[PDB]
Symmetry: D3
Subunit: 237 residues, 6 copies
């Protein structure tokens, strides 16, 4: 076990899907995986392992924010033999043509966190996904007939920012979705030698003010999960 996961090597698949919400992890396990078993509940951060079309797969919450997900992703990689992490999250949109419930794939993740500067001697570390994982997601989505845009996310430390003007800058630079984790997970993946990808579903739009309910975020963003799971199968070929 590790300080935040009461499990043993073997309990997790070598690929883990990770939403921020452990309740979404539960819904995914119950809906998409066969023979699902709970493999963690420390701090209520539910994780499960099951099979999807014969392929062993795990799904576990990572909590909100870079510091939270950095803990779980590190633990999975060093102690549970996890090779790939697919974050399956929600994000806010700033772009006019990005719509509620759109699926976005974060090839890169910008951030206002200091964690990567701490890692990288105060220079700019480009927090990027694994290329093959990005391509597997894109191809899985095309096979599924689900649209998906690929580009930059922005991983914010403050969901409630005092600096509203930063959204104008994000939009200018083509940021697809604003969430709170991708850059941190990508940093961890680089530090500990694993592969990672963040896929998000647009749960609110910052300019139009539209949003989804907490219940909707918890269970209904299934397009991204299908993409994630099928991308794993492509990855195995």
């Amino acid at each position: 076990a590790t300080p935040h996961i009461n499990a043993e090597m073997g309990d997790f698949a070598d690929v883990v899907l990770m939403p921020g919400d452990p309740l979404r992890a539960k819904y995914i396990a119950e809906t998409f995986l066969e023979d699902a078993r709970e493999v963690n509940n420390v701090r209520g951060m539910l994780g499960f392992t099951g099979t999807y079309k014969g392929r062993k797969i795990s799904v576990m919450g990572h909590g909100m924010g870079i510091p939270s997900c950095s803990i779980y992703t590190k633990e999975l990689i060093t102690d549970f033999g996890v090779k790939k992490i697919i974050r399956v999250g929600s994000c806010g949109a700033v772009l006019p043509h990005v719509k509620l419930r759109d699926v976005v794939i974060g090839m890169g993740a910008c951030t206002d966190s200091k964690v990567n500067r701490i890692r990288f001697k105060d220079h700019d570390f480009a927090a990027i996904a694994d290329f093959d994982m990005v391509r597997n997601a894109v191809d899985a989505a095309k096979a599924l007939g689900i649209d998906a845009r690929v580009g930059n996310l922005f991983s914010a430390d403050l969901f409630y920012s005092p600096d509203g003007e930063m959204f104008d800058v994000m939009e200018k630079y083509g940021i697809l979705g604003v969430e709170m984790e991708a850059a941190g997970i990508y940093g961890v993946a680089a530090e500990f030698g694993a592969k990672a990808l963040t896929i998000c579903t647009v749960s609110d739009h910052i300019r139009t003010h539209e949003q989804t309910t907490a219940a909707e975020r918890q269970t209904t963003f299934n397009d991204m999960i299908k993409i994630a799971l099928e991308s794993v199968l492509l990855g195995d070929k």
Copy 2:
């Protein structure tokens, strides 16, 4: 209701105790409060309201790290009329004379987070607790036969430090304990005009945890007078 809290104004007391672990919040509610009711379970971040010695009190998890607890504390303050937040958590000690099971009260919280720099035009914001709450907690501990240490915490963004350079520096400048939240909560309290305090037990013991919760709850009653 907010995106992160499925409740309405009135469901929370004006004072909220917050451990990181929502299961700890459940434990606190079931152990210390009368008539405990679950008032939030969005994302499993359990929140409860009940009474302690007749005083309305809430307890809810804040999750791990500055960004997580920043969300919950802001929403409680701006949407649920919360006036005081007391974080009740664990910390790792750095000093030789700061023993295991010691109670530490964070009058200040250092951090390697950028959030307060974002707030404060890239200058040094001293992230501090509300003094009356600190005094209340010190007095409540004394009444219970405990000498709490009062001083600086360090709120880390990285539980798993890439290099661990900061540990010796924290020791050098007299930091009492390392955790992952206080500096963020204090920033929120300052930003939105509320009062906050972080209390921790040195974990690097069900008695001392209970002791800390008793300190927090009794400190609130002191503040009410």
Copy 3:
């Protein structure tokens, strides 16, 4: 003697009150201390030692700004056995409801100086006072009928700051008073293992109770700490 203080161990009490102005130190010594003697005059930075209600006490100017007071406080702590430093100064208020002559106690001090970042590997060091000292001062003030405000100071490097809008930021985050030293003194205290406190009187409002009372508060606060 140290590079900036021509005195020897024993010349200073283990508690030193420090105004920015050395002539204010002279005034405090003549007004409050019995059998006061001058113990330093290097650079005109007048220091004195005497007694207050029988308690040995020193008072000495620290000059203006973090770099200046950092020198004097370090030398006092490392070479003269000083355990407690109490800065007694004036500050500007940015909050509407803070009044002229309000007393402010800096439990913390924000700053735009780089000194604590240099100490703290470019992270945020929370520059704080010693809790017991803060409490002693609150209690001493209350005994005199004064409700001191307890919270953050901001220690500016520039008295003539080019960034007026920062004062709005200070107001938004609840800064009680603006001066030029607290954060530096608190960094020195942490660095060298001592205790410090800054008490200020509000002398003006930035942008569009007496001094003797403040000194009494600081001195009486020491007596409480002794008990």
Copy 4:
């Protein structure tokens, strides 16, 4: 014309290959393109336009360093209608089994430059390539039977680093190649709304001290040019 390019709209193709070395640009024009004509010589920064397998294509030097290539790529995007830029460069390797003449594709670019912080309110902008261009390069390389790793570059401001320890940090975080431009070009592409990709050839090894000659860098790194040109043809499809 623009301040650094004496040419007119239409003189450049909508895709431009750019080495930092204008003499490599000249070699590429003479060697890979038919009917190539010089379209720029301002400051000796040679630019050419010709066809590759019937497709109009340009190649032009961008000079050494972020500030130099930022000027040229900006002027090309805003004033000559250029839609895609492919940097075709050289780089130093820090990883043990990245060897001389290996081709590396920068899906991202780290940097110690301040330019993106200036653009992005002092936060972390993830300087990334256009995904489709990355995939086109990967596919072209596969078709050509040429190996090419995809990952992070590091765009340095100081070829001669005072801080040698930074190479250890690059190595730790899996940096494939150290050059001096990708992150700047990616920042310009984002700022002015175009698409970019950096492909490099390993010209020296920072650890073993193996290195190629100035002549070899000028005129023998042809694998990366084949990939770049074939990838454009894929993108057109």
Copy 5:
């Protein structure tokens, strides 16, 4: 030889003049130097060695931007025994009384580059010229009857700056000229123990005239070297 300079110790004089444009280096060699010989052409960054009034002089382009000129100046100093470097460039003006064609001598160079912060542990390194060289340049200009201002340049990383407001800040602080190199050259000079100076002519305010003015700058630079030898 170095990866960016195909030449050997001795091919260069111990003083090198450097415009950004290698073609202007070629012009200088051809115009003011005798017996000029091309000594570098890697990346087309032309370098020449000749004599001016009997004194061995080199001139070579440095390309655009701090990273570019930093490579050339470093290599000239460490591998080619170069002692003094004089940048002879163009700049943009932000001050009212600074006119097109004015000659500015950069005793200092401000910058928005991170290179000196990298050198100097994230503190403020004042990127300054060598005093004697500045004085030689001022004295030569006087001898030639050319007026010159001595002050701060600003070395910008982005010719196309997203931050329009910074030019107001430069003006407020008396920046004489905005170019893209001096601060980097000065950092190199300090790092490797050589001497440097940047002289610029104002080419913009943010034909035959530009010629005369360019020549004037070159004459100041060359004549200042002679003064420095004395």
Copy 6:
């Protein structure tokens, strides 16, 4: 009068020499000035005005550190018509070839203070002296048979630094002397539109370990003051 100077316009000359120690200002007034009179004593920061070779000259302490000297120099400039400020101080050396008693003229001043960053939008402001004042000082020193070094000072915020390694960095980039004021004075002069120069005598060494006599130090001090005073006369011509 101003908040830190209880004097009236005309009480100061248009040139003010400024040592850190107000007692040194008194010494200078008594030793070099005719008909000296005290014109300030607020905070014990003694200032005097008199004549040197018939020329009106002032001398006033500035206290220790950037924040202290920034207050005094600003007030002299905006409210007392002061055009030139000459700091005359002591400094520590880091270079072995820089000897105790050397005279150093700070044409530039590096610093670890944030004050110039605050002024200059977080970029690098080169804190410099006025060129003519530097030249006047070099010439005055020559005429007195003294060879002054001209280059960079480093203005430190911390006389007792926790960062011992910074001295190696200073040495590496050729810093001549370490003091605590020059960069702040130069920042003020630039902000409020006056001219400044800092001259220092080397009084200690961080790397070497010579030791002088008080007699030698007073001679050298006097030498520096003569240089400052004579440099003013040169500038008047």
